[PDB]
Every structure is written in structure tokens, then in C-alpha cells.
Amino acid sequence: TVADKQARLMPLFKHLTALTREKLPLDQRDERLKGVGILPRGTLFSCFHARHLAEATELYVALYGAKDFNDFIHLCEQARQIVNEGMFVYAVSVAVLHREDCKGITVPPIQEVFPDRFVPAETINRANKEASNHPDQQSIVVEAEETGNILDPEYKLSYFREDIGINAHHWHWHIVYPATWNPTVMGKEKDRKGELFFYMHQQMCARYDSERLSNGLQRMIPFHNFDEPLEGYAPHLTSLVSGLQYASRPEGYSIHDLSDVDVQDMVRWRERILDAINMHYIVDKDNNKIPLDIEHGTDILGDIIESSDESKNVEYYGSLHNWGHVMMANITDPDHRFQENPGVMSDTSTSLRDPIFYRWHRFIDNIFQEHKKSFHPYTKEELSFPGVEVVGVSINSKTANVITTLIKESLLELSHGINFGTDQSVKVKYHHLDHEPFTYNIVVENNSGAEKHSTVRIFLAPKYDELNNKLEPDEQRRLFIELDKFFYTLTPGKNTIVRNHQDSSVTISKVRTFDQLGAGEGVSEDSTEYCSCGWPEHMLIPRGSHKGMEFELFVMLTDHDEDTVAGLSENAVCSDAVSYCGARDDRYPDKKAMGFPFDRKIEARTAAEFLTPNMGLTDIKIKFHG
Amino acid sequence: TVADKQARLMPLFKHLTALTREKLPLDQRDERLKGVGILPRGTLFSCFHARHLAEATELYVALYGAKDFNDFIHLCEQARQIVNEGMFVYAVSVAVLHREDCKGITVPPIQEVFPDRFVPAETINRANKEASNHPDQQSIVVEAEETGNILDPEYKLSYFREDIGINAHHWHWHIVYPATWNPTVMGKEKDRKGELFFYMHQQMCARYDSERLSNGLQRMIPFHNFDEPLEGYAPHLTSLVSGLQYASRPEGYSIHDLSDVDVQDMVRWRERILDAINMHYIVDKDNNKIPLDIEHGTDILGDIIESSDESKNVEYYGSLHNWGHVMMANITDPDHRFQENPGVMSDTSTSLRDPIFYRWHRFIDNIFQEHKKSFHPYTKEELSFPGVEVVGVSINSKTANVITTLIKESLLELSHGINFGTDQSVKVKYHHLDHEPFTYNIVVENNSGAEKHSTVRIFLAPKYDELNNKLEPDEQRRLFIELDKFFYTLTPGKNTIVRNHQDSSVTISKVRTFDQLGAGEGVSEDSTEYCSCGWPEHMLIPRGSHKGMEFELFVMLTDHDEDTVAGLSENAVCSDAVSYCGARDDRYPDKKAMGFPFDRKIEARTAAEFLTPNMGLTDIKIKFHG
Amino acid sequence: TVADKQARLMPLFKHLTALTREKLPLDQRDERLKGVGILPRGTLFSCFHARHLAEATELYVALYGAKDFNDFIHLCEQARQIVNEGMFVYAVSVAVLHREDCKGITVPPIQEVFPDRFVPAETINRANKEASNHPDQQSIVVEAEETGNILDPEYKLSYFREDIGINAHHWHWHIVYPATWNPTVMGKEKDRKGELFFYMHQQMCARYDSERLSNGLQRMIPFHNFDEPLEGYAPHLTSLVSGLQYASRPEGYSIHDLSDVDVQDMVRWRERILDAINMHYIVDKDNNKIPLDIEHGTDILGDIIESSDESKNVEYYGSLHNWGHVMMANITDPDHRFQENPGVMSDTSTSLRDPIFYRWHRFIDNIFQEHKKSFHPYTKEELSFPGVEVVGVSINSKTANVITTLIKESLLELSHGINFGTDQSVKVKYHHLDHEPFTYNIVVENNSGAEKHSTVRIFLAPKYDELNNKLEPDEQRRLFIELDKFFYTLTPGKNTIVRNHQDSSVTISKVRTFDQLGAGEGVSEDSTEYCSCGWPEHMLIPRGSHKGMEFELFVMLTDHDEDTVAGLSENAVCSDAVSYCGARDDRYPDKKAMGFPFDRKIEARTAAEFLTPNMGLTDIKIKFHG
């Protein structure tokens, strides 16, 4: 049964670190690999680096190739013995997500699988220590929160950057859309992966910026200049695999050439993207030019920038984004003479924690923005949905139009990830931001005679700037974060549409723990995205401040008939986030450009001026509770 | 497989009539149909009448609603027993075309399903007679051509009007774009259906006019005045399903009110429409005004005129086109006291045969024309594609620049449609117009440095008028028929583009027979046009005359980058026939107004004066072979 | 899904009577049947008659042949239109039971499908009348119990004979083991069907006899002599299909020749079976002799006697059992000049109600008994399980060692079976025998060192004869009824095994109503046997008397290792009765002859003398509550 299948998968995931000791007593046995097998076990796996990705792709293909599920388990079991463990988790998760046979199946928790990435070394040490200190079945609980002098104001952001859910999501997203993805081999293609790459990262930056403003900090600045020295960050993460840890970075470091590729190369590739934009056309390998067409243009750029296998030219264009992660990651030892491990930037699970991440991503986002700039703005025609008027919006909470945010304690179970020994469970306690539940009530007047179908789009943007209160829509575009997108039908006359925050399309409703999965539930059975992907729920709104920071609440209704050609496939099944995740093996359900109406330049000085009749702005307050 | 699915659907439709006998003892049993259960089995189904359309729509929805294909077959199986058969074929065909379970399921050929509509009564009852006369497995062949005194010159046109392919196409087209189509229910919308409605019918008229001229007859005149008496036409079609036949109409009696509608109302609807066109806006139900925009205007008008469900106002504007068919159809018994069946005008399969069809359609076309008139003409800017020059065009055939047309015999197999009994097959032999294959060679000079992409548009228009030789482009607009539209890439320097007639975008390459289908065919797993629509191939060019009538051959090249739309749709699907049919589940592939450059008024006295550098006219001859 | 599949099946079953009106307007259409199609719709279908069975078999094969489930539904839907309805239900049920595709699926209730067979004409008339009398949504309830003078003491037995559950079971059993069953065609074979045929019928007789004794009536006598006149029985059943009903029989009728086969033929076949027994060997068609081997011998006899398709010789041996039903059924009109319907004997659903059934079945049982007689008795060796001793047995109820039996009212919903019209539901109230729940506690001493596995067999036999109290084991063999058979493991030392009556292997735990089935439960999804087959639970013990009739309670433990070679396949899934039903697509799980230890002759004068150490008898009382 499916349940049995789930059980088999969980053990593929257990004791990965330990699973090593290849113990296939003749090297010749795998003639299948006679000139490959290159990255050893203990080594850190880089999600960004090309060579690592190539190996990973090779692994996935074998998994995809597996004739049946049983065969799948077998090769996996065997492969896991030899290959580097990180690569293995990566390859398997991709396989589980896509391979039909796996119509059954969650992947074990990333946080749970590698607890060391989620929690600090101190807590991990303590738990391990307590386990040894007194042998006893009794459970161990450790509170990760610590006590320290907080020198850097960046620390304030830690609730966002360090959040377990956020890191997990980032890991999962890359799994759903792998850079290595080869559509020919799989046969299936990932719709608009390049564009999604752009959108997801942009949102992370946008959301990040809202945190800084909530904090009273200015917006992050892009890492435009390669020459500038980076700010330092020390992760305090250990790798349980070994004694080694992610190397910390002090500040004052400009970016160094690596043996692999060099800063100059980064520049070239940047000059190179720009030409293609200016010339309205990119050079394929064939030396043909492809136009940066209206719908297409973001997607093509996304593939080139990341870059994915899909890039029209890898050799002229390179892989700017990925190399950025690699270069930043080994700033400490570009030479690798030190034989030190890379920083957090190397891994999709960890990278969000470093503040540098935002600087780089804003830089890349800028590239996309220049492209967007080339496009013409939106006419009333494009925006408006005639006959429909938005009367008002209200948010209901304990206090209307105010959302309250607080910190909540939570526990993570280490036992699946690290050797438990005698103890039944070792849990680490951490705290994260959370908010009260709320609902939206939108009153819409349907002037038309017949029932209409509308897509409701809701975004949140900060009211205040760093100078004073200024709702300049051009700037707002960067800041706006997507709360929700959903379909509703309106009858003629007045209508009130109520939606609850819980329903939000952006967030993952729930991630099942390896324990829940040990039994067998019925969200349904799809895969790596299942409970994993989606933005985390606690994260839905920015922290705000004790004072109650003012944010613009924007609701827009668009013609659904227009919006969805097709693409209302799987219902509330395993995964549940379309806004950032897309839909399983079906289209991202919306014709509009991701981020619409915000994606193109706004002529108006004030946001209010921008509004059409089917748009509305309600100012609400977010107040944090200490 | 999908082909096994074929083999079941075809015997579902095979012999419709005898699958009636509802045979469900309690009427209440099918609560599923408690809303309908109004039009009995034997009665003729009207494609035009509103009430009939409503029932049909209700049926389709159930079919669309069907959860899965198996469920689809079940409801269909049982529904067919109770509903009128004509309605049933209509509803099912629509379902097959749209519903995703059905790709690669062609329908049973209409001609084959209802042979009686395609062939004359004499060859229906002769064939039936032969079957009874001598029982024997042996095949029966009957030649439909007959022998008779040919009093009316209209008879000459019969090759065009009576053509099997033409009638079939008309049936199919209405299926792809149903008047009843409700986008909300389906969720998907038919792009530019109103405009397509206009374009397709206009082409039929235009093509018809070319036949008359080839014949030496004057162009058809519109049925502007409701008062005028109609010319008579006797179809000689029987409906085997019953004894009944389509009632013939003699000439010479003015128009009669039906219980359903009065002629005065028809006149009203016209003055209503004309006014709107005039003041440049139409009134919605909401009593808001929508402008007749250049982009939108034809589409909005098409919906109102037909009228479709899409019409912005049904209760003010009415349904002029459809009522026209109904009124003409029951001219013989407006009262229906006679209880006589309607004429050919009632059915999409038959309507083209009656000469009245053209008179009415020209009338409606006129309505569209007035709208077109309001639009400004095309500047050199719009027409020209700079840097591209058309040097010359040549048509290659047995004799260059001459196309030969002849009559070819063909056979139609009755057996699927009517009860065969003992005989293996009963075929009726008919003759149709056909032409020799030919190719076009266009020499184009690409002045630009880079490769360009062009859409080649080819049209044919008669050189001679009724008076004498006069290439007055204004008049030509009505006459021009579309030969082909395709994309080609031009390198710098001289280029020669060759295209074969077979490739023509206007025509259907092949219609598979029941026999072909039982054998089976295969495509991707989605839902599409059921190997259907597209103009018949033999029909591609007008008959011409033995003398070799002169026609202007017009070729124009336009910038493809401008012409195409960007978006993400399917694999190679039913796109052969894009010019008249559109593309399956796709937006119309050409930005230009349908019929461009011909749609707007032409200032010049002569066509030659109109030409820009990217246009060319070659005079060719069409000669018929007796 | 399975649920959807269930839904499709239920409608195959609805309005069967009505489903007629073939309405396939040309007879030639089904060339597949061009020389068959012989029994009209309205006619009564005989489960026994050979010609009817042949048609039924032909139908099933088509259903089995169906490529997929969807195809299955289609042919079924179409076939049901033409074929006689009774045959149809029979063929479909068989298909549902065996055909894998139907890994989904209960069959709609027999009682519910044909309520008229279960309830008396009066009640059915009343319900129908009430429906018409006052139209109203309101529910109708009718109490079937009636009021009448009860002339015949046979009436007392009516609770047993008339029981709804019993009749339903009999219907289902024949479906699981069809006489027509051809193993070559299906490919699969029904293990020991001939023997099971013998065992099931024998049990019905045995159980019947216990009722008579409980009643104070003597045991039924076999219908040995063909000459003797039969006792009359009037069923009072109507067939809703038509106005006709099962013809009643008065007494005083000796059995008449029918056109089909004659009494003399019955005798021949009887003389013929006997020879084969005496000669130790039966004549196959090949004229080879097959020995009436130890294990095999009952099975071979069963096939010949019934007779099934499996019979080694149909033409020498005939089909005695089946013809008996036919002959008795049309005693009233052997000639069929009267054109009267057959009696209850014709149908598996109805036959148990007639008292004649027992007389005939005892006669046939006698045939089997003679065969059993030829076998040698059981030695201590065969019976005993050494090292195991049964200390005692106790039955726990309200009062220990006493079981209480009462009458319970129940309602049956007619609506699925007969045209409901306006009413939501029409229920008929009936009463049936029922008993208090009880448990058994068996103390067993396991002398051996190791754990043993035992099969516990429990039987019940009447203590009293018609003369006075005499536990003569030879006679008891006929009377003993099987309460339960189950596997238990015994450790060394004393053990107490407790089993509840509810668990009984003989009975069906629950039959799901068409209403329950309208939703979707998880007993699992197997088929006609699902809730249907198994003996009914209320029926588990005989009525007993108010005085508290004494019955011997016999418990025996046997070596399980010995007992099951293989055959512990499907668990508590859809069907749940192994003792009488066998297991789905797996062996009847017991090596021992069915009815062991009772099947062979017992030398001893008293039952007690028979007991070995692993056997025990506890006398309990059954007392009925008025």
C-alpha cells in the first residue's frame, strides 16, 4: 500500500551520515560508473556549483530511470552507500517529487533529517552531551534561545533569517525546480521555471525588506559592485557528520578568484546579459537571436541568469547567480588551501540565514527589473475589470484592521537526524514569529447583469519610508508582498467575500513530521513539496512594531475568465501553495505576470492615483507584542 | 486505448433513430433531465432556434460535467435514448471536441452518420430499394448524378452549394463555436468567436460570389428588404428517420410572422444594431455603454448579431441572424398548422445548399461592413514591411500561371448512417469540383542586414466584373478569398519561398472515414477538435471557366514579430486549418484583423495603386475542363 | 475511484423490470446473437432449468470477457435492455463477484432489488396503494405480519422458512458457485464446488430439522418416492413485473411429466448414480472409470448430482437435483397449457420458503449419505489430538448455559426495488427470530512442552428425539449444525479460549443496504458474497422452546498444522463466512471433510462414548421468549 511505500522511503532518509562505508569490495563492480564517482562522502555538497549539480543530475536520472518503485528503492539503497550524502538527499527528493511510482509520498523532514542545519551548535552539543552524560530513557529538552550580548542590529532580523520554516521552504523550492532539470530526459517540462525562479527570489527579498522596515532599518542595498567588501556573518552551525562546521565570515572581505571561475568572469556575464537586453535579442548557441518577447522574456532571462540547463547559451552567458553563491561561500578560502568548509551560502537550506543573501539577490533582482523596465506600463484597459467596483475591504481580527504578532515557542525533534542512542527523543526548543488569525471582508458591487468570476489578489506594502510617510507606488513595487490569490464568483448586486488567512495560497498549511508520517494521513500523497514547500504560515505577515506599523492593504479583482485558460487541476491535496510553488504537474494557474499589477513601472506619484475601480487600499496596522 | 474509445463512440452514434424508444418506465427516473423533456425524438432540430439551442446547451453541460470518460459514455448512452437525436448529435460533438478526455477522438463523419442530408432522396430510396430488392451480401452502388431538365441557371452553382465537404464544414464550425457557449460554465472561453463568426460567414459569401462570376453570373444581392419575396428552392432531401423530408419552397410570397417571432421584430433589431454602430457604442444590460473599439468592435458585434450567449444585450438587440434562418426555414408553414418540416435553412449541414443562404448572409455581412466603414483606412505605415520587397510570384502547375479545374467522381458509404441489413456496403457516387495541384514561388528581397520573419498572406480575387474588366479595389474587398497564411523566415539577400497548395491553411487535409477511425489514430493525451473543420481541399479555388477566367493573385508579406502573440499552449494539434478554424484551445494566431488587408475601405481606384513594396499581384488563369 | 465504481454498479441494478423496451430499432444490429435470444423479458427465470442456465452462462461470459470495467458497464447497460431481467441479475452478479475489475464492489440487495420476493403480496399491494392513495412526500410504513387463522402447523416454521436473510443467502451462494461455471473459460476453478454444494444444502436441511424439533415436530422425511403426492404450499408472492405471481400448489399432486424431461428420466438417473457407487467407479464420457476416491469422491458426486458443467457424464447421469426443482415448480401446469407461472421452487431466492424444498433436499442428501456410508469410520487416531485435553466448556449469556431467543421487528426498504413515485421511502415491517449474544469459554490443557495450534470446531445437536431423550450419535449426525470454526494457539499448561458468537464463521456479520452503499465503507471491496452470503446472524441458533429445549454443545479441537496446508488468505474484508461460503479465490481453509467429525458413521450407541480427549459436550438450554 501507499503506507508501506511511505515506510520504505523514510528509511532511505535515515542515518544518512552513517550510511557511508561503501562496502562493495571491488571497485570494478560498478562499471556503470568506471570514469565517474568524484565527490567523497564527508565533503559538503553545493547546490550552486556546476560540477556538483552535474553529479546530482546524473543521480536523479538513474532514480527516474528506475523501472519500478521496488527497483527505485534498490538502487537508492545501494547508491546511498557510495555517493556523497548531501547529493543523495538532493537526488532522492527530486525523484520522490516527480516519479509517478512515488504517487504515495512525503519526504522526511529536512529540519528533522538534518537538525544541525536548523539549530545552533550549542544546542546540538548540549543534546548530544546530555545523551551521553546520563544514560537514561528519559527525554532531553534543550532551549535553543541562548543568552548573549547582541552587538549587531542585524541580529534583530534573525527571527526572519534564522526561521526554520523559511530555510526548509527554500530547500524544497529548489527541489521542485532544479537548475539541472533536463526536460528531454524527463520528458516533462517545468512550466515557467525561469520566471518562477525570478518571482520566488524576488518575493523573498521583498519580504525581507518589509522586515527591515518593520525593524526601522533601511531597505537592503544590492551588491552591485564586486569590489566592495562583504559584511561578516557567523552561522554557528556544526555538521554532525564530522567535527567541521560552516566557516564563518568576517567583514572586510572583497570577493576573491576561485580556481573554478573568476570575478572577471562574473563581470563579463553581466556585460553580456545587458547587451542581449539592449539588442532586444539574445544569442542562442546557434547564433540565432531570440527576442525578449512579452510573456516569454522573463522566463528566458531566468534560465540564463540562474542559470539552468535551459539557458539558451551557457558559454556566452555563464551562470551568474549560482557562481555568486559559490564565490561568497568560499570567500574565507578561495584557494581552498585551508581546506575549510564553505559558508551557509553553499546550501539552499542555510543560505537565507546570511544577510549577504539579500544583497546578492537584490542584485540579481535588479537584472530582472531592467528587463521589466523595457516593457511598457499597464493601461486602464489591462488593469480594469469593468462593471465591478470594490466598495471596501476590512480585516477582522481581535481588533479590526489590526493584526497582532508575537513570538511562539516550538520544539524540533532531533532523533531522526542525529544518533539518539538511549533517549526516546531529543527536542530542541526554538522561538519564531507568529500572528493572530484574521479574515478579510471585501464588498464588491457587480454592476453587470450576469454572474462574474474574479481572481482576488491581495498584497501588503509598507506605508512608511526611511524619510517619512510616502506611498510612492514606483518604490512600493519592490516592497509589495503577496498575501493571497483566489477565485470567487460574484452575483449581480452587492457581494461580500470573506476569506481567512489560513486559506492563504502563499503558505503551506502544514508540514507533517516523520512521526505523523510514521502513521498515515490523507492530505493526499504527492511529494517533496507536500508539507515542505509553500511559505511558512507564521511568516505570512511582517513583524511590524509594538507601535503598530502602518501597511497598505491592497486588494484587486481581475477577470478570471481572462486569468485562467486551463489549470485548475489538483485540489486540496498534498501540497497547498500555488502563489510561490505553482501546481503539481500543471500550470501555475494564472495568466497574469507574476507579481501583477506590481511588475511594471508605475507612472503615478501616489499609489492611490494608480487605483482603478476594481482595486482598493485599506490601511491596517501590524503591532508586535513583546 | 484512445482508438478503442473511438470504436465505442462510433456505434453509439450509428443509426440514432432506432436507439430511441426511451424504455424507462417512469418519466421521473431521469431527474437529470427534469429541466428539459420538451422536444420529441422525430422532430427536426434547429441549430438556429433559441429554445432548441437552450436544450442543446443543457445537454452539453451534462456531458462536460461528466466526471470521467466512462461516466461520459454512460450518460451519453442513456441520454441518447430519450432526447431528440439531432440535438444529441449536436451536444455530443461539442462535448467530444472540448472535453479533455477526448483527444484523437474524431467524430463519426457527419455525411456518413446522416447520409440522407448529403445525397438526394432518389439515391437514398434507390439504394434502400436495392437492399430489399434482392437480398445478397453483394455491394450496392448508386450514382447520385441523375438526369433532368435543368431549367434554373442557379443549378450551375450546385457543384458549390451541394458539395458534401462544404456542408460538413459548416456543421463542424458551428460545433467548435457554439452560439450557446457559456464561458463561465466551461470556464474556458473561445477567443474572438464573434469575430470569427463574422469572418467565416463572410468568406463563404465571398467564395460563393467567385463561383457566380466564374459562372458568368452577377454577384449575389443582399436580402435587405424583408418585404421582398424569396426565390424558391427544392432540396430533394429525405429524412429516413421518419417519412418526412425538408419542405421545399417555391418563390413569390412575402414574409410571414411566426408564433415565436414577428418580422417587425427582426426589422427592429436591425435598426437597433445600426444605431449602435452609428453612435459607436452599444448598451449593456447594466445600461452602461461599451465602445465599439477598433480592437474589440467586431467581436462584440458578432456576439450581438448572431447572437450568442455572449451578447451584451439579448433583450434589446435580439438574435437577428438566427431568427433569419428560422423564419426562412418555415416560410412554407409559418403557422405550423400544416405540421410540415422545416426547409434546409434550419440545419447547419444543409443550409448552404439553398441559394437564399447567401442573400441573408450578405445582408448580415453588410451589417459588419458598416462597422468596418466607420474605421479609418490603413496607412502605408500599417501595411508596409520595410526592407522587404516582393520581386515576383509565380504559380507552378502543368502550365505555369494556369490552374486547371475538373469534376471528379467520389463515393460515400451509407452503411454507417442507414440500416444496411444484409449488404456489406451501400455507396452513393457523386461528383465534385477539383483542381490540379500547384505551388507558389515568391521571390523576396530582404534589404535588411538580419534575417526577418514574415507572414505570407495569399488571396485570390476576380479580375472581371459584370460589366467589363475593372480592378476596383473597393469592390474587390468583398470578393477576395483567402488561399493561405504561413510563416517563413527570410535571410538577407534574395530568397525564394515555395509553398504547395496542399499545405494551405484554409483547408482540411483529410477527413478520416468511419473505416479509417476504426483502424485508429493517435495524438497526445488532452482534448481537441475531432479531426475537424477547415474548408474542403477540392474547393480551394473557384471553378473558373473553360476559357480560363482571369483572377488576381495577391501575395503580401507582413512582419511576423508583430503578427504573432506570445503565450504557452500545446503540441502540434489541429492547426492545418487555422485560417477559418483557429487553433485548438489557443488564441487566434494572427494579430491582424481577419481579412487584412482587405477589411478596411480602399481609397484607390485601382488595386495596383494600393500595393506597397511588400505586396504583389500576379494574374493567373483558372480554366475548367469539361 | 472505487466509490464511483460502486455508484455505477448500483444503477445497473435499478428499475430492472422497467429497463426492458429493447429499443434497438433493427434486429440485425446484434449479429453477435443472430440465432439466439430466446427467453423474453417478462418470463420467469429458472435457476435450475438447463436451457435457462445456458443463456445465463452465455451472458456471464460476455461480462467476463469485457476488456475493462468501463466496457463491462457498457455491455451490461445494453444487454439489460433486451435480456430477461432475472437472467440479467443473475449474470451480472456472477460477473461482479468474479471479475477483478470489480475489485470494488457490492451488489445491490437482493431483498431490496426485488422486495416482492421477500414480502407478501398484501403488504406490497398496500404500499403501492398508499403511494397512490394520497400523494405526499411522507413516508409509508406497512407491517407485513398480517392477521389470519393458522390452519397448518407448518406455519410455525415460517419464521425459519420465510426469513429474508436465509432466502438471500441461498441466492448468493448459487451465485458464488454457479452450476454453469466453466473453469476453462474463466480459467479459474472453484475449489470443491461439488462438495460444497453437498455441504451447504445438507446444513440447510440439518438446520431445518432442528427447527422442527424445537417446534416439537418430527424430522422431515425425504421425498424418496416419486409417486407420492406433494403437500401444498401457497406462497402469496406477487411479481411486480407483471400482475402474475408464483403459482400456489395444493396438496394431492403427484409429479407429472414435463415436455422437457420426464419422471422416468429421474428414476433412470437415480439407478444410474447407484451403479457407479456400487461399482466403486463412475463412467466418464470417455467410458473410462474414475474411482470414488477418498477426498475426491464427494466432489465428483456433487457435480454429477446437481449437476454442474463439471459432471463427468451429463448424458448417462443427467441432472437430478435441478430437474427436481423444475418438476416440482411446474406441478400445477406440467403441460404449460395454462401458461401459469412456476412456483417458488423455480427461484433460489424463494425456494427455501416451500416445505417441499426440505423433502427433496433430504432425498438428495440421502444420495450423498450412501456414498459416505461406503467410507470407513474414524479411528481414535484420526480424531484425537494428543496431549490436548478439553477440560470443560461454558457458555456465557445472561444466564450461563442458557441462550435466549426472541422475535425482533425489522423494516425493509422497498424503494430501490419498486417504483417509489413521490414517496421518499416505503418500508415494510417484518419480524424474525433472534437470540441474545453469548460467548464460549473452553478450558484446554496442553500437556505438550510446546505451543500448539488448534482448530476449534463447535456444533450444536438436539438432545431430544420424537420418542424420548436419546443421544444416539448415528442419528445425531444428520441434526448437527455448525456453530463455528476458528484457529487458536495454545501454550503449555491450562488455557482458556473465549470466543464470541458475533465472530461465528458461519454467519454474515452485516449486509450493507443500498443506502449505506450510496456512501462508501471499508469492510473492504469484494462482491456478491460481500454482505449477502454467509448464514444470517439472527439464525445462528435454533428457536428452542419456552421451556428451554436441551441441546448438546459439542466442541472439538484438532491439529491445525494438519488442518491447513495453505489457505489463510484474505482477512476480515468484505465477505466474512468461511464455514459455508469458503474464501474468496482461495481454498475452503480446512483439510477435514466438511462436517467432520460428523460425516462418517458412528459405531457407538451414545454420543458420549464417541468422545475423545480433545472433544467435549456441554448441555445447554435454548429458551424462546414469547
Side-chain angles (χ1 to χ4, degrees), chain B residues 545-566:
Chain B
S545 296
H546 191 87
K547 63 166 180 176
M549 184 180 180
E550 293 184 50
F551 288 82
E552 180 180 308
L553 180 64
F554 180 83
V555 180
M556 180 189 180
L557 292 65
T558 300
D559 188 353
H560 183 83
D561 290 335
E562 180 181 17
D563 287 336
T564 187
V565 297

Side-chain angles (χ1 to χ4, degrees), chain A residues 192 293 295-296 381 447 453 561 564-565 587, chain B residues 183-184 187-189 286 296 566-568 585:
Chain A
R192 292 166 39 145
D293 203 326
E295 187 171 318
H296 298 122
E381 175 80 36
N447 295 312
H453 301 273
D561 290 335
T564 62
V565 177
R587 202 171 195 131
Chain B
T184 64
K188 71 166 182 181
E189 46 284 299
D286 59 354
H296 303 86
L568 295 172
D585 190 356

Side-chain angles (χ1 to χ4, degrees), chain C residues 450-522:
Chain C
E451 296 181 69
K452 265 67 186 306
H453 301 273
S454 65
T455 300
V456 174
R457 307 169 190 268
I458 299 169
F459 288 81
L460 183 65
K463 188 168 180 190
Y464 292 85
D465 209 87
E466 331 300 0
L467 301 332
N468 212 311
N469 185 128
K470 61 184 202 66
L471 287 174
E472 292 180 24
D474 194 13
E475 293 183 43
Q476 294 180 243
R477 298 181 301 137
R478 282 304 187 89
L479 299 56
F480 288 103
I481 63 168
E482 181 181 2
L483 284 283
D484 194 8
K485 189 170 303 175
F486 56 97
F487 169 85
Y488 196 82
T489 301
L490 296 68
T491 63
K494 298 161 187 71
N495 292 282
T496 61
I497 308 160
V498 176
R499 177 59 104 83
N500 62 339
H501 80 89
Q502 294 288 175
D503 280 346
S504 180
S505 298
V506 299
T507 63
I508 180 71
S509 59
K510 178 71 174 296
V511 61
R512 300 303 167 172
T513 173
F514 202 129
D515 294 20
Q516 295 228 235
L517 296 174
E521 299 170 301

Side-chain angles (χ1 to χ4, degrees), chain B residues 224-460:
Chain B
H224 183 276
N225 190 344
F226 286 69
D227 290 349
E228 298 292 47
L230 296 65
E231 302 78 12
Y233 180 75
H236 299 89
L237 289 289
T238 60
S239 70
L240 69 180
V241 306
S242 183
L244 295 61
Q245 66 180 26
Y246 292 93
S248 59
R249 188 206 308 92
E251 74 291 343
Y253 304 23
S254 188
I255 199 71
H256 305 141
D257 293 300
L258 301 181
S259 298
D260 291 53
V261 176
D262 54 297
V263 169
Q264 180 180 179
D265 288 2
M266 295 287 279
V267 176
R268 291 199 263 248
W269 294 325
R270 165 182 27 72
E271 292 312 89
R272 293 181 162 159
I273 295 171
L274 294 180
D275 187 358
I277 293 176
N278 294 311
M279 300 178 297
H280 284 67
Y281 63 80
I282 66 167
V283 296
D284 290 350
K285 294 291 268 61
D286 59 354
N287 284 341
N288 288 222
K289 275 71 183 199
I290 65 158
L292 302 180
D293 192 18
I294 301 167
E295 295 180 311
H296 303 86
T298 302
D299 190 358
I300 62 173
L301 181 62
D303 63 70
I304 297 168
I305 201 297
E306 186 178 356
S307 63
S308 62
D309 288 16
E310 293 180 9
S311 180
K312 286 167 180 74
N313 196 340
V314 292
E315 52 154 322
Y316 183 56
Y317 296 110
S319 56
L320 179 66
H321 170 273
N322 289 328
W323 285 111
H325 284 263
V326 176
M327 63 180 179
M328 289 180 174
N330 62 354
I331 187 77
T332 180
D333 189 10
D335 186 299
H336 193 85
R337 56 180 167 268
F338 286 102
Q339 293 180 59
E340 295 180 53
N341 290 3
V344 297
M345 208 71 177
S346 307
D347 195 349
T348 180
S349 297
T350 59
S351 64
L352 293 180
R353 58 205 310 121
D354 195 347
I356 64 167
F357 175 102
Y358 302 99
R359 199 171 180 177
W360 174 256
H361 285 78
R362 274 293 180 197
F363 174 80
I364 56 179
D365 182 7
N366 292 310
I367 300 167
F368 297 96
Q369 295 291 356
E370 292 191 8
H371 184 77
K372 295 300 182 175
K373 293 166 66 289
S374 69
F375 294 81
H376 288 84
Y378 294 109
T379 302
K380 299 166 187 297
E381 175 80 36
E382 180 70 307
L383 300 180
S384 296
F385 182 70
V388 171
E389 180 187 313
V390 175
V391 177
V393 177
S394 297
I395 51 180
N396 294 102
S397 282
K398 180 63 279 298
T399 301
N401 293 324
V402 296
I403 192 167
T404 302
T405 180
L406 296 68
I407 180 284
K408 180 171 291 66
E409 58 182 305
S410 180
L411 297 180
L412 180 67
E413 180 185 330
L414 301 187
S415 296
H416 299 280
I418 71 296
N419 188 299
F420 55 102
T422 64
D423 55 24
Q424 293 180 340
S425 180
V426 296
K427 297 290 180 65
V428 63
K429 170 174 158 186
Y430 58 84
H431 300 85
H432 60 80
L433 184 65
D434 199 359
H435 60 85
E436 180 184 358
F438 57 84
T439 185
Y440 301 103
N441 190 329
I442 176 59
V443 176
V444 176
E445 175 74 13
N446 190 349
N447 295 312
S448 71
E451 297 181 69
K452 265 67 186 306
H453 302 273
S454 65
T455 300
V456 174
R457 307 169 190 268
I458 299 169
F459 288 81
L460 183 65

Side-chain angles (χ1 to χ4, degrees), chain C residues 18 93 209 248 327 361 415 427 449 452 479 483 506 575 596 602:
Chain C
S93 183
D209 286 353
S248 59
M327 63 180 179
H361 285 78
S415 296
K427 297 290 180 65
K452 265 67 186 306
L479 299 56
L483 284 283
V506 299
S575 276
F596 173 85
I602 297 169

Side-chain angles (χ1 to χ4, degrees), chain B residues 97-98 169 172-177 188-197 199-201 203 482 485 503-509 527-535 565 569-592 594:
Chain B
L97 197 190
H98 304 85
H169 172 79
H172 298 296
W173 185 96
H174 284 273
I175 280 67
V176 294
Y177 294 85
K188 71 166 182 181
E189 46 284 299
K190 288 297 180 175
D191 288 318
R192 292 166 39 145
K193 63 178 297 291
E195 180 179 351
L196 184 81
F197 170 83
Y199 181 75
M200 178 70 278
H201 290 80
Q203 289 289 295
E482 181 181 2
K485 189 170 302 175
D503 280 346
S504 180
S505 298
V506 299
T507 63
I508 180 71
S509 59
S527 65
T528 56
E529 280 67 18
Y530 49 90
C531 196
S532 260
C533 218
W535 208 242
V565 297
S569 323
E570 219 203 59
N571 68 263
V573 71
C574 198
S575 296
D576 193 47
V578 279
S579 297
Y580 300 159
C581 305
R584 150 251 249 282
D585 190 356
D586 192 16
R587 194 178 194 144
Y588 192 78
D590 193 347
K591 200 71 290 180
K592 268 61 194 285
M594 295 180 183

Side-chain angles (χ1 to χ4, degrees), chain A residues 44 55 89 130 312 376 379 391 398 418 457 520 606 621:
Chain A
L44 295 63
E55 294 180 55
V89 64
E130 291 183 51
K312 286 167 180 74
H376 288 84
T379 302
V391 177
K398 180 63 279 298
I418 71 296
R457 307 169 190 268
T606 189
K621 303 288 185 160

